Amino acid sequence: GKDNTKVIAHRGYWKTEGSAQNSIRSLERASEIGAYGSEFDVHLTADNVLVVYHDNDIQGKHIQSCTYDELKDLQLSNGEKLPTLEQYLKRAKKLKNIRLIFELKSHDTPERNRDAARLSVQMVKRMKLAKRTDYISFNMDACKEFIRLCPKSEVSYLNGELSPMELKELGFTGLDYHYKVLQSHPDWVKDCKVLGMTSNVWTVDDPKLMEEMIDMGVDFITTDLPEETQKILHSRAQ
Ligand SMILES: [Mg+2]
Ligand SMILES: [Mg+2]
After folding, report:
1. Structural domain that includes position 39
2. Is 70 annotated as a binding residue?
3. Alpha-carbon dihedral sign for residues 218, 224, 225, 226
């Protein structure tokens, strides 16, 4: 029957010429290929500036305890400067076709996670992107604050241990779980459907596994090879 699986470019479309994880180029290239969404990772600096980067440390600097001034001139793998979230969102605003899959990274206390989530929602709001921005996090305190602040927004849990029923009760609108969790709990995708929630799986790059997850009926696949997933979905729709 009909596949209902859409493609999320993990860290943007970075496995392509001139691109880099979590970059302006990767966001642009995700849009250029027509992916459903582009995922990116967000930290709050010591001085409350939101920046875009996966790892907790960049070139020996721990992002969450450093000021933005210490970090601002550090370069990505393609020579771009470390993006501010504001810069990321200014570019995303002109890219109309694409959903923004905003991962808030885990912060150092529950209260700091709440602060990072509040400031994230404020930035998304002032940049006029609340309609196109979905939140994901490993951190439960961050997720709960996004749910509280944005009851009509999409919020999915990353960490893998809560059933869809448990997530629905907390006000989540989806799960976004490691593929092995969904292999270990093969009924959770169906339960999400029954519960009116979305299912997302990360980070799936092997073609046999993409097929397995599409067969299971995941709403989204988060991948470092987004064009391969698109090809597979196109061939299957023939
Ligand atoms: Mg079919
Ligand atoms: Mg991420």
Report:
1. 1-238
2. no
3. positive
